[PDB]
Amino acid sequence: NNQDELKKLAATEAAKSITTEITLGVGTGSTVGFLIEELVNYRDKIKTVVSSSEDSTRKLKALGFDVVDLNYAGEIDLYIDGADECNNHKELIKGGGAALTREKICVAAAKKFICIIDESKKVNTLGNFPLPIEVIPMARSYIARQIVKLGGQPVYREQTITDNGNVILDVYNLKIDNPLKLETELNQITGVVTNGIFALKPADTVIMATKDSNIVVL
Amino acid sequence: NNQDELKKLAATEAAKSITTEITLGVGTGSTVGFLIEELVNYRDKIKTVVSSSEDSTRKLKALGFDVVDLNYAGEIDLYIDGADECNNHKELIKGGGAALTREKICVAAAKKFICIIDESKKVNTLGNFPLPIEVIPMARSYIARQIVKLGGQPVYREQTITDNGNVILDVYNLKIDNPLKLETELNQITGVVTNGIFALKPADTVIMATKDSNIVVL
Ligand SMILES: O=C[C@H](O)CO
Numbered sequence: 001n002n003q004d005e006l007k008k009l010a011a012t013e014a015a016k017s018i019t020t021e022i023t024l025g026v027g028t029g030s031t032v033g034f035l036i037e038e039l040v041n042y043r044d045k046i047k048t049v050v051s052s053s054e055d056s057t058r059k060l061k062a063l064g065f066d067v068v069d070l071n072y073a074g075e076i077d078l079y080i081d082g083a084d085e086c087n088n089h090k091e092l093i094k095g096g097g098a099a100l101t102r103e104k105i106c107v108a109a110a111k112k113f114i115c116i117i118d119e120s121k122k123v124n125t126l127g128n129f130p131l132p133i134e135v136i137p138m139a140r141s142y143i144a145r146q147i148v149k150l151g152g153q154p155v156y157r158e159q160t161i162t163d164n165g166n167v168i169l170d171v172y173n174l175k176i177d178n179p180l181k182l183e184t185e186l187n188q189i190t191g192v193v194t195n196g197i198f199a200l201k202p203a204d205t206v207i208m209a210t211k212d213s214n215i216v217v218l
Numbered sequence: 219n220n221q222d223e224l225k226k227l228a229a230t231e232a233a234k235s236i237t238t239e240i241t242l243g244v245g246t247g248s249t250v251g252f253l254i255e256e257l258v259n260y261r262d263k264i265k266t267v268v269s270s271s272e273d274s275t276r277k278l279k280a281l282g283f284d285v286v287d288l289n290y291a292g293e294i295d296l297y298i299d300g301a302d303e304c305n306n307h308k309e310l311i312k313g314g315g316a317a318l319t320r321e322k323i324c325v326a327a328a329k330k331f332i333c334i335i336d337e338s339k340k341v342n343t344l345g346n347f348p349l350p351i352e353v354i355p356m357a358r359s360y361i362a363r364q365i366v367k368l369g370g371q372p373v374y375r376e377q378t379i380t381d382n383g384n385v386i387l388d389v390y391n392l393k394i395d396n397p398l399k400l401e402t403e404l405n406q407i408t409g410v411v412t413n414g415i416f417a418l419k420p421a422d423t424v425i426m427a428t429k430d431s432n433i434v435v436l
């Protein structure tokens with residue numbers, strides 16, 4: 001297997017979109033890890049870095065990058081991040097491992113979002129990967145009940161805490177054939193901070209490393 | 219303290235709805251302070267107490283009530299709270315005391331929501347009192363910009379952190395003629411934790427103390 005080589009390929013290809021002086025936004029996760037290492041070749045163009053997690057921030061600072069709060073940066077020119085799932089319309093499930101809320105905020109504040117994935121993330125319909133939802137701890141049980149009513153199977157990630165001080169519910173069993181509609185419905189549930197459907201603002205570009213080490217750009 | 223007398227009047231009237239043994243939900247603020255005080259008369263009827271703020275929890279425990287986390291309380295039977303504004307359809311603006319998120323969660327989980335106000339909170343169109351919006355800190359400026367596109371004037375509430383570790387934007391200039399629509403569209407903004415429009419789940423009962431010390435029930 002060469003999943004790491006595919007991740008590195010997609011990350012290396014994406015970094016080439018850094019062609020001018022920008023405020024760069026950086027995702028979280030294993031694929032982004034390869035992207036972060038590649039950024040040492042673009043120091044002349046990276047004016048400002050905004051980070052979606054403390055894990056990414058730690059890695060970026062170790063490489064000599066000046067990571068600033070989004071409030072100080074204003075807007076991101078280019079945000080680069082991975083995904084758990086990507087469908088045929090560049091709509092994503094994100095937030096599996098960490099950073100759901102700040103990743104979604106970074107995407108919102110970014111003029112361009114490039115998603116980097118290996119082929120295993122590519123699906124026709126979202127939902128096989130469980131949907132992460134970050135929730136206010138006090139509302140966890142109420143929200144789980146409302147998700148049951150929506151047809152999902154909610155599970156509490158017991159003892160997990162986000163860097164926003166919140167908890168996570170994973171939703172299993174969902175066939176998400178209408179991402180726009182379900183992302184909207186979940187946003188309406190009191191106590192939901194963020195849900196992991198990235199559809200209302202999808203990826204602008206998807207760089208996919210294929211099983212044969214080719215690059216396909218959606 | 220004429221207004222204080224009106225608030226005590228409204229709170230005393232609401233407390234009389236505690237007729238059977240219930241799971242009680244407690245709001246936040248000066249009006250609720252008079253209700254909490256009155257709760258000593260209803261001890262034998264209050265099995266469980268859920269609190270909407272740390273401030274209310276300290277007060278409730280100072281009077282020897284057992285404050286119970288909503289997750290093991292399950293469903294609130296009766297929630298009593300105040301508001302910043304109440305229109306003609308029992309749709310509210312809340313969050314002047316910065317506790318809107320947990321208050322909104324309590325309302326969602328409550329079988330009956332009783333809102334207690336003096337007549338100065340009664341309006342025909344919501345929005346003259348600034349709409350509070352709880353916001354993930356890193357998303358503050360981004361959200362401020364989006365609020366401007368909705369015709370609002372966002373002002374960061376200085377030196378204020380919520381029980382949930384978040385910041386508040388107070389939004390001026392909105393004429394909220396369709397609170398259901400605006401509440402829905404603010405829920406769609408990435409980084410918004412809770413907005414202070416209580417309309418999709420309005421109050422079930424409003425108890426209003428008028429300027430001539432009478433009680434009007436809406
Ligand atoms: O405490 C002040 C306001 O009633 C918050 O809703």
Ligand code: NA
Binds near residue numbers: 187194410411
């Ligand atoms: Na939200």
